[PDB]
Amino acid sequence: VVGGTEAQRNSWPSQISLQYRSGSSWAHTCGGTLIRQNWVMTAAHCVDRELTFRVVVGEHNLNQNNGTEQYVGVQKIVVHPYWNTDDVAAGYDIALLRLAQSVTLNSYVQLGVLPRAGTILANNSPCYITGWGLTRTNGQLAQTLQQAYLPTVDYAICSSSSYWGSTVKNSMVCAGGDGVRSGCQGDSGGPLHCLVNGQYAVHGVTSFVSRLGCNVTRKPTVFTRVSAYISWINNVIASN
Ligand SMILES: [Ca+2]
């Protein structure tokens, strides 16, 4: 997250860190949303590599013991059957990860609240991005969970030529584009939390930024639209 502020420990308890096994170490690669005690929602592209993955819940500082973490292996990965590595701009950037164990819920570990199917927000809807991603374009990861106020940019505007044009589909959410705050590498697969009827719900799964840079004016961060996928999500979980 470029232009973030440090999150409070208990603000976003559905955020996980998706990590891969790197020599003898575990490195952060993506964010995710805990949507059941045994199911994580992330981006497809974050599990295109055949790595050994683990999920960390209750995580605040990547490099310290917070006293709150639970570290859980991934037992099954279900990517959207339409996902194509070679075409992010097509969409379907979403995956469900089944956890080897159920986690325990507490004030650091909760489930993310999903939108009703078909829900579109109005332009300029108040949402936050959260993540341990790069804090500058070509920068480094954050140690602590960053948050950024990232208001939505409607389809009509986002698809217009000055903005993303044709690259963005109506199965996506655009948020931000001010030149100052954005998603950046390592935020991918995480949440976009938006305030609807007094409740934060997870509307977006972070998917891409511009090739020219993370924080680029009139290139909002682009998210998979979760509300486009509710029947898919539900069908996966009922049947595994
Ligand atoms: Ca920690």
PDB file of C-alpha atoms and ligand atoms in Angstrom:
ATOM      1  CA  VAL A   1       0.000   0.000   0.000  1.00  0.00           C
ATOM      2  CA  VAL A   2       1.405   3.368  -1.131  1.00  0.00           C
ATOM      3  CA  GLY A   3       0.219   6.298   0.996  1.00  0.00           C
ATOM      4  CA  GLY A   4      -1.135   4.097   3.796  1.00  0.00           C
ATOM      5  CA  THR A   5      -1.243   4.648   7.513  1.00  0.00           C
ATOM      6  CA  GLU A   6      -0.484   1.804   9.970  1.00  0.00           C
ATOM      7  CA  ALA A   7      -3.662  -0.183  10.822  1.00  0.00           C
ATOM      8  CA  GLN A   8      -4.771  -0.744  14.421  1.00  0.00           C
ATOM      9  CA  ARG A   9      -4.278  -4.444  15.533  1.00  0.00           C
ATOM     10  CA  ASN A  10      -7.903  -5.254  15.691  1.00  0.00           C
ATOM     11  CA  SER A  11      -9.291  -3.179  12.832  1.00  0.00           C
ATOM     12  CA  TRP A  12      -9.315  -5.700  10.033  1.00  0.00           C
ATOM     13  CA  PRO A  13      -9.454  -9.162  11.588  1.00  0.00           C
ATOM     14  CA  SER A  14     -10.383 -10.937   8.369  1.00  0.00           C
ATOM     15  CA  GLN A  15      -7.054 -10.019   6.701  1.00  0.00           C
ATOM     16  CA  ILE A  16      -4.586 -12.886   6.296  1.00  0.00           C
ATOM     17  CA  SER A  17      -1.060 -13.128   4.911  1.00  0.00           C
ATOM     18  CA  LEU A  18      -0.518 -15.754   2.230  1.00  0.00           C
ATOM     19  CA  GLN A  19       3.099 -17.024   2.451  1.00  0.00           C
ATOM     20  CA  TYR A  20       5.250 -19.469   0.416  1.00  0.00           C
ATOM     21  CA  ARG A  21       8.112 -21.721   1.562  1.00  0.00           C
ATOM     22  CA  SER A  22      11.408 -20.074   0.563  1.00  0.00           C
ATOM     23  CA  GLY A  23      14.505 -22.182   1.352  1.00  0.00           C
ATOM     24  CA  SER A  24      14.140 -22.588   5.096  1.00  0.00           C
ATOM     25  CA  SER A  25      11.994 -19.454   5.408  1.00  0.00           C
ATOM     26  CA  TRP A  26       8.361 -18.379   4.760  1.00  0.00           C
ATOM     27  CA  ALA A  27       7.968 -15.248   2.642  1.00  0.00           C
ATOM     28  CA  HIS A  28       4.806 -13.043   2.307  1.00  0.00           C
ATOM     29  CA  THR A  29       3.420 -13.083  -1.225  1.00  0.00           C
ATOM     30  CA  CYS A  30      -0.269 -11.966  -1.105  1.00  0.00           C
ATOM     31  CA  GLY A  31      -3.136 -10.956   1.028  1.00  0.00           C
ATOM     32  CA  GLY A  32      -6.393 -12.899   1.483  1.00  0.00           C
ATOM     33  CA  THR A  33      -9.827 -12.739   3.321  1.00  0.00           C
ATOM     34  CA  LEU A  34     -10.907 -15.359   5.868  1.00  0.00           C
ATOM     35  CA  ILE A  35     -14.492 -16.201   4.820  1.00  0.00           C
ATOM     36  CA  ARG A  36     -14.907 -19.444   6.804  1.00  0.00           C
ATOM     37  CA  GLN A  37     -12.869 -20.967   9.652  1.00  0.00           C
ATOM     38  CA  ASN A  38     -11.429 -23.289   6.991  1.00  0.00           C
ATOM     39  CA  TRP A  39     -11.681 -21.187   3.784  1.00  0.00           C
ATOM     40  CA  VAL A  40      -9.663 -18.182   2.528  1.00  0.00           C
ATOM     41  CA  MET A  41     -10.589 -16.056  -0.502  1.00  0.00           C
ATOM     42  CA  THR A  42      -7.539 -14.721  -2.482  1.00  0.00           C
ATOM     43  CA  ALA A  43      -6.584 -13.864  -6.116  1.00  0.00           C
ATOM     44  CA  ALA A  44      -6.033 -16.611  -8.622  1.00  0.00           C
ATOM     45  CA  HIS A  45      -2.751 -15.096  -9.807  1.00  0.00           C
ATOM     46  CA  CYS A  46      -1.240 -15.421  -6.274  1.00  0.00           C
ATOM     47  CA  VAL A  47      -1.400 -19.199  -6.598  1.00  0.00           C
ATOM     48  CA  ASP A  48      -0.297 -19.660 -10.226  1.00  0.00           C
ATOM     49  CA  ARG A  49       3.101 -20.948  -8.908  1.00  0.00           C
ATOM     50  CA  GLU A  50       3.197 -24.530  -7.616  1.00  0.00           C
ATOM     51  CA  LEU A  51       4.711 -23.446  -4.232  1.00  0.00           C
ATOM     52  CA  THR A  52       4.032 -24.740  -0.732  1.00  0.00           C
ATOM     53  CA  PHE A  53       1.581 -22.164   0.780  1.00  0.00           C
ATOM     54  CA  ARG A  54       0.597 -21.262   4.355  1.00  0.00           C
ATOM     55  CA  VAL A  55      -1.929 -18.868   5.689  1.00  0.00           C
ATOM     56  CA  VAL A  56      -1.304 -16.623   8.715  1.00  0.00           C
ATOM     57  CA  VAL A  57      -4.309 -15.180  10.590  1.00  0.00           C
ATOM     58  CA  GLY A  58      -4.180 -12.627  13.475  1.00  0.00           C
ATOM     59  CA  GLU A  59      -0.981 -11.221  11.868  1.00  0.00           C
ATOM     60  CA  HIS A  60       0.055  -7.602  12.412  1.00  0.00           C
ATOM     61  CA  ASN A  61       3.914  -7.352  12.084  1.00  0.00           C
ATOM     62  CA  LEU A  62       5.469  -9.780   9.533  1.00  0.00           C
ATOM     63  CA  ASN A  63       8.788  -9.834  11.390  1.00  0.00           C
ATOM     64  CA  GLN A  64       7.849  -9.944  15.062  1.00  0.00           C
ATOM     65  CA  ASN A  65       5.870 -12.203  17.367  1.00  0.00           C
ATOM     66  CA  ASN A  66       2.562 -10.378  17.932  1.00  0.00           C
ATOM     67  CA  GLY A  67       1.367 -13.014  20.350  1.00  0.00           C
ATOM     68  CA  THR A  68      -1.798 -13.416  18.210  1.00  0.00           C
ATOM     69  CA  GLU A  69      -0.847 -15.414  15.033  1.00  0.00           C
ATOM     70  CA  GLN A  70      -2.241 -18.822  13.943  1.00  0.00           C
ATOM     71  CA  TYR A  71      -0.273 -20.529  11.151  1.00  0.00           C
ATOM     72  CA  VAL A  72      -2.233 -22.975   8.981  1.00  0.00           C
ATOM     73  CA  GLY A  73      -1.313 -25.046   5.889  1.00  0.00           C
ATOM     74  CA  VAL A  74      -3.406 -25.025   2.646  1.00  0.00           C
ATOM     75  CA  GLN A  75      -4.947 -28.391   1.840  1.00  0.00           C
ATOM     76  CA  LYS A  76      -6.801 -27.561  -1.442  1.00  0.00           C
ATOM     77  CA  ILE A  77      -6.658 -24.736  -3.982  1.00  0.00           C
ATOM     78  CA  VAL A  78      -9.692 -24.059  -6.198  1.00  0.00           C
ATOM     79  CA  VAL A  79      -9.078 -21.452  -8.842  1.00  0.00           C
ATOM     80  CA  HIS A  80     -11.927 -20.049 -10.943  1.00  0.00           C
ATOM     81  CA  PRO A  81     -12.268 -22.361 -13.967  1.00  0.00           C
ATOM     82  CA  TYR A  82     -12.253 -19.269 -16.316  1.00  0.00           C
ATOM     83  CA  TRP A  83      -8.931 -17.888 -14.884  1.00  0.00           C
ATOM     84  CA  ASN A  84      -6.199 -17.417 -17.462  1.00  0.00           C
ATOM     85  CA  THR A  85      -2.611 -16.609 -16.286  1.00  0.00           C
ATOM     86  CA  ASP A  86      -1.909 -14.888 -19.600  1.00  0.00           C
ATOM     87  CA  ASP A  87      -4.984 -12.629 -19.407  1.00  0.00           C
ATOM     88  CA  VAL A  88      -5.590 -10.762 -16.034  1.00  0.00           C
ATOM     89  CA  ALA A  89      -7.551  -8.183 -17.950  1.00  0.00           C
ATOM     90  CA  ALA A  90     -10.141 -10.920 -18.744  1.00  0.00           C
ATOM     91  CA  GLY A  91     -11.011 -11.054 -15.028  1.00  0.00           C
ATOM     92  CA  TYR A  92     -11.890 -14.197 -12.940  1.00  0.00           C
ATOM     93  CA  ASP A  93      -8.985 -13.367 -10.661  1.00  0.00           C
ATOM     94  CA  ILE A  94     -10.284 -15.242  -7.601  1.00  0.00           C
ATOM     95  CA  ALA A  95      -9.476 -18.450  -5.711  1.00  0.00           C
ATOM     96  CA  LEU A  96     -10.652 -20.363  -2.697  1.00  0.00           C
ATOM     97  CA  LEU A  97      -8.080 -22.031  -0.483  1.00  0.00           C
ATOM     98  CA  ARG A  98      -9.183 -24.810   1.871  1.00  0.00           C
ATOM     99  CA  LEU A  99      -7.131 -24.783   5.160  1.00  0.00           C
ATOM    100  CA  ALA A 100      -5.692 -27.965   6.688  1.00  0.00           C
ATOM    101  CA  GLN A 101      -7.219 -26.935  10.035  1.00  0.00           C
ATOM    102  CA  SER A 102     -10.040 -24.683  11.149  1.00  0.00           C
ATOM    103  CA  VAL A 103      -8.748 -21.533  12.865  1.00  0.00           C
ATOM    104  CA  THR A 104     -10.184 -20.182  16.187  1.00  0.00           C
ATOM    105  CA  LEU A 105     -12.070 -16.939  16.037  1.00  0.00           C
ATOM    106  CA  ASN A 106     -11.286 -14.116  18.557  1.00  0.00           C
ATOM    107  CA  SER A 107     -10.863 -10.386  18.351  1.00  0.00           C
ATOM    108  CA  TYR A 108      -7.915 -10.694  15.934  1.00  0.00           C
ATOM    109  CA  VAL A 109      -9.476 -13.474  13.818  1.00  0.00           C
ATOM    110  CA  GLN A 110     -12.947 -12.945  12.353  1.00  0.00           C
ATOM    111  CA  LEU A 111     -14.716 -13.761   9.081  1.00  0.00           C
ATOM    112  CA  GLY A 112     -15.057 -11.179   6.305  1.00  0.00           C
ATOM    113  CA  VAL A 113     -18.659 -10.156   5.536  1.00  0.00           C
ATOM    114  CA  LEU A 114     -19.493 -10.667   1.857  1.00  0.00           C
ATOM    115  CA  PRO A 115     -21.834  -8.432  -0.200  1.00  0.00           C
ATOM    116  CA  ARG A 116     -25.136  -9.618  -1.558  1.00  0.00           C
ATOM    117  CA  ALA A 117     -24.778 -11.046  -5.126  1.00  0.00           C
ATOM    118  CA  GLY A 118     -25.068  -8.347  -7.852  1.00  0.00           C
ATOM    119  CA  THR A 119     -24.267  -5.419  -5.518  1.00  0.00           C
ATOM    120  CA  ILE A 120     -22.658  -2.399  -7.280  1.00  0.00           C
ATOM    121  CA  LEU A 121     -21.566   0.623  -5.203  1.00  0.00           C
ATOM    122  CA  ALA A 122     -22.127   4.172  -6.292  1.00  0.00           C
ATOM    123  CA  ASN A 123     -19.309   6.285  -7.394  1.00  0.00           C
ATOM    124  CA  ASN A 124     -17.176   7.620  -4.668  1.00  0.00           C
ATOM    125  CA  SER A 125     -18.138   4.924  -2.076  1.00  0.00           C
ATOM    126  CA  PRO A 126     -15.892   4.902   1.055  1.00  0.00           C
ATOM    127  CA  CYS A 127     -13.620   1.906   1.091  1.00  0.00           C
ATOM    128  CA  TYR A 128     -10.250   0.998   2.582  1.00  0.00           C
ATOM    129  CA  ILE A 129      -7.492  -1.231   1.069  1.00  0.00           C
ATOM    130  CA  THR A 130      -5.358  -3.160   3.557  1.00  0.00           C
ATOM    131  CA  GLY A 131      -2.109  -5.028   2.938  1.00  0.00           C
ATOM    132  CA  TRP A 132       1.563  -5.629   3.678  1.00  0.00           C
ATOM    133  CA  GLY A 133       2.458  -4.727   0.075  1.00  0.00           C
ATOM    134  CA  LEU A 134       5.272  -2.393  -1.222  1.00  0.00           C
ATOM    135  CA  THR A 135       4.923   1.056   0.290  1.00  0.00           C
ATOM    136  CA  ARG A 136       6.426   2.764  -2.865  1.00  0.00           C
ATOM    137  CA  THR A 137       6.568   1.654  -6.529  1.00  0.00           C
ATOM    138  CA  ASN A 138       9.695  -0.640  -6.662  1.00  0.00           C
ATOM    139  CA  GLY A 139       9.968  -0.081  -2.863  1.00  0.00           C
ATOM    140  CA  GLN A 140       9.771  -2.740  -0.175  1.00  0.00           C
ATOM    141  CA  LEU A 141       7.023  -4.576   1.771  1.00  0.00           C
ATOM    142  CA  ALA A 142       5.598  -3.033   4.932  1.00  0.00           C
ATOM    143  CA  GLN A 143       6.404  -4.760   8.276  1.00  0.00           C
ATOM    144  CA  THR A 144       3.013  -3.769   9.767  1.00  0.00           C
ATOM    145  CA  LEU A 145      -0.453  -3.817   8.224  1.00  0.00           C
ATOM    146  CA  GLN A 146      -1.056  -0.592   6.258  1.00  0.00           C
ATOM    147  CA  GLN A 147      -4.448   0.844   5.395  1.00  0.00           C
ATOM    148  CA  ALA A 148      -5.419   3.425   2.697  1.00  0.00           C
ATOM    149  CA  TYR A 149      -8.723   5.321   2.113  1.00  0.00           C
ATOM    150  CA  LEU A 150      -9.537   4.409  -1.421  1.00  0.00           C
ATOM    151  CA  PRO A 151     -13.030   5.623  -2.687  1.00  0.00           C
ATOM    152  CA  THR A 152     -14.580   3.778  -5.620  1.00  0.00           C
ATOM    153  CA  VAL A 153     -14.571   4.926  -9.263  1.00  0.00           C
ATOM    154  CA  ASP A 154     -17.589   3.689 -11.160  1.00  0.00           C
ATOM    155  CA  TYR A 155     -17.448   1.463 -14.199  1.00  0.00           C
ATOM    156  CA  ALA A 156     -18.490   4.280 -16.574  1.00  0.00           C
ATOM    157  CA  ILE A 157     -15.681   6.405 -15.444  1.00  0.00           C
ATOM    158  CA  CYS A 158     -13.091   3.693 -14.914  1.00  0.00           C
ATOM    159  CA  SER A 159     -13.559   2.265 -18.393  1.00  0.00           C
ATOM    160  CA  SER A 160     -13.268   5.596 -20.038  1.00  0.00           C
ATOM    161  CA  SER A 161     -10.238   6.286 -22.110  1.00  0.00           C
ATOM    162  CA  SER A 162      -8.478   8.646 -19.720  1.00  0.00           C
ATOM    163  CA  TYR A 163      -8.623   5.957 -17.006  1.00  0.00           C
ATOM    164  CA  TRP A 164      -8.348   2.218 -17.730  1.00  0.00           C
ATOM    165  CA  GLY A 165     -10.361   2.052 -20.944  1.00  0.00           C
ATOM    166  CA  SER A 166     -11.177  -1.406 -22.074  1.00  0.00           C
ATOM    167  CA  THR A 167      -8.819  -3.151 -19.690  1.00  0.00           C
ATOM    168  CA  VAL A 168     -11.422  -3.068 -16.894  1.00  0.00           C
ATOM    169  CA  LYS A 169     -14.600  -5.119 -17.028  1.00  0.00           C
ATOM    170  CA  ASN A 170     -17.855  -4.805 -15.173  1.00  0.00           C
ATOM    171  CA  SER A 171     -16.757  -7.820 -13.134  1.00  0.00           C
ATOM    172  CA  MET A 172     -14.180  -5.535 -11.506  1.00  0.00           C
ATOM    173  CA  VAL A 173     -14.151  -2.636  -8.930  1.00  0.00           C
ATOM    174  CA  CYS A 174     -11.899   0.354  -9.355  1.00  0.00           C
ATOM    175  CA  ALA A 175     -10.861   2.317  -6.266  1.00  0.00           C
ATOM    176  CA  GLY A 176      -8.542   5.321  -5.895  1.00  0.00           C
ATOM    177  CA  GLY A 177      -6.515   6.840  -8.738  1.00  0.00           C
ATOM    178  CA  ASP A 178      -5.461  10.034  -6.921  1.00  0.00           C
ATOM    179  CA  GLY A 179      -1.732   9.625  -7.570  1.00  0.00           C
ATOM    180  CA  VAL A 180      -0.998   9.370  -3.813  1.00  0.00           C
ATOM    181  CA  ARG A 181      -2.722   6.256  -2.393  1.00  0.00           C
ATOM    182  CA  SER A 182      -2.883   2.847  -4.104  1.00  0.00           C
ATOM    183  CA  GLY A 183      -2.490  -0.959  -3.853  1.00  0.00           C
ATOM    184  CA  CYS A 184       0.994  -2.111  -4.827  1.00  0.00           C
ATOM    185  CA  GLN A 185       2.896  -5.468  -5.308  1.00  0.00           C
ATOM    186  CA  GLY A 186       2.247  -7.802  -2.323  1.00  0.00           C
ATOM    187  CA  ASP A 187      -1.259  -6.349  -1.695  1.00  0.00           C
ATOM    188  CA  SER A 188      -2.705  -8.727  -4.402  1.00  0.00           C
ATOM    189  CA  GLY A 189      -5.485 -11.115  -3.196  1.00  0.00           C
ATOM    190  CA  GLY A 190      -6.364  -8.887  -0.217  1.00  0.00           C
ATOM    191  CA  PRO A 191      -9.588  -7.076   0.731  1.00  0.00           C
ATOM    192  CA  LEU A 192     -11.173  -3.852  -0.245  1.00  0.00           C
ATOM    193  CA  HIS A 193     -13.458  -3.088   2.730  1.00  0.00           C
ATOM    194  CA  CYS A 194     -16.456  -0.776   1.948  1.00  0.00           C
ATOM    195  CA  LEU A 195     -18.959   0.732   4.405  1.00  0.00           C
ATOM    196  CA  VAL A 196     -22.469  -0.244   3.476  1.00  0.00           C
ATOM    197  CA  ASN A 197     -25.446   0.201   5.816  1.00  0.00           C
ATOM    198  CA  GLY A 198     -23.083   0.750   8.760  1.00  0.00           C
ATOM    199  CA  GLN A 199     -21.064  -2.452   8.210  1.00  0.00           C
ATOM    200  CA  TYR A 200     -17.675  -2.984   6.504  1.00  0.00           C
ATOM    201  CA  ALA A 201     -18.001  -5.718   3.878  1.00  0.00           C
ATOM    202  CA  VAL A 202     -15.393  -7.070   1.481  1.00  0.00           C
ATOM    203  CA  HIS A 203     -16.298  -5.843  -2.037  1.00  0.00           C
ATOM    204  CA  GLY A 204     -12.958  -6.346  -3.810  1.00  0.00           C
ATOM    205  CA  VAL A 205     -10.112  -8.862  -4.062  1.00  0.00           C
ATOM    206  CA  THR A 206      -6.993  -6.887  -5.079  1.00  0.00           C
ATOM    207  CA  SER A 207      -5.977  -7.811  -8.600  1.00  0.00           C
ATOM    208  CA  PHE A 208      -3.771  -5.317 -10.499  1.00  0.00           C
ATOM    209  CA  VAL A 209      -2.059  -1.924 -10.762  1.00  0.00           C
ATOM    210  CA  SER A 210      -0.618  -0.076 -13.735  1.00  0.00           C
ATOM    211  CA  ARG A 211       2.660  -1.242 -15.300  1.00  0.00           C
ATOM    212  CA  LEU A 212       3.788   2.378 -15.039  1.00  0.00           C
ATOM    213  CA  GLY A 213       3.587   2.340 -11.228  1.00  0.00           C
ATOM    214  CA  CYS A 214       1.379   1.676  -8.223  1.00  0.00           C
ATOM    215  CA  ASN A 215       0.241   5.162  -7.386  1.00  0.00           C
ATOM    216  CA  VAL A 216      -0.587   6.554 -10.840  1.00  0.00           C
ATOM    217  CA  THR A 217      -3.143   9.407 -11.319  1.00  0.00           C
ATOM    218  CA  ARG A 218      -6.220   8.095 -13.121  1.00  0.00           C
ATOM    219  CA  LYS A 219      -5.064   4.466 -12.808  1.00  0.00           C
ATOM    220  CA  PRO A 220      -7.156   3.256  -9.805  1.00  0.00           C
ATOM    221  CA  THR A 221      -6.236  -0.001  -8.238  1.00  0.00           C
ATOM    222  CA  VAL A 222      -8.441  -2.742  -9.861  1.00  0.00           C
ATOM    223  CA  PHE A 223     -10.174  -5.389  -7.835  1.00  0.00           C
ATOM    224  CA  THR A 224     -12.151  -8.504  -8.696  1.00  0.00           C
ATOM    225  CA  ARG A 225     -15.829  -7.646  -7.921  1.00  0.00           C
ATOM    226  CA  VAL A 226     -16.755 -10.118  -5.121  1.00  0.00           C
ATOM    227  CA  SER A 227     -20.522  -9.633  -5.658  1.00  0.00           C
ATOM    228  CA  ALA A 228     -20.054 -11.028  -9.207  1.00  0.00           C
ATOM    229  CA  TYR A 229     -18.893 -14.324  -7.638  1.00  0.00           C
ATOM    230  CA  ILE A 230     -21.224 -15.181  -4.739  1.00  0.00           C
ATOM    231  CA  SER A 231     -22.922 -18.189  -6.443  1.00  0.00           C
ATOM    232  CA  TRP A 232     -19.506 -19.579  -7.406  1.00  0.00           C
ATOM    233  CA  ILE A 233     -18.119 -19.113  -3.879  1.00  0.00           C
ATOM    234  CA  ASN A 234     -21.127 -20.765  -2.273  1.00  0.00           C
ATOM    235  CA  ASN A 235     -21.094 -23.784  -4.712  1.00  0.00           C
ATOM    236  CA  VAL A 236     -17.392 -24.394  -3.984  1.00  0.00           C
ATOM    237  CA  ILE A 237     -17.779 -24.417  -0.242  1.00  0.00           C
ATOM    238  CA  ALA A 238     -20.936 -26.568  -0.151  1.00  0.00           C
ATOM    239  CA  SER A 239     -19.162 -29.129  -2.262  1.00  0.00           C
ATOM    240  CA  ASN A 240     -15.710 -29.475  -0.657  1.00  0.00           C
TER     241      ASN A 240
HETATM  242 CA    CA B   1       3.761 -11.362  13.706  1.00  0.00          CA
END
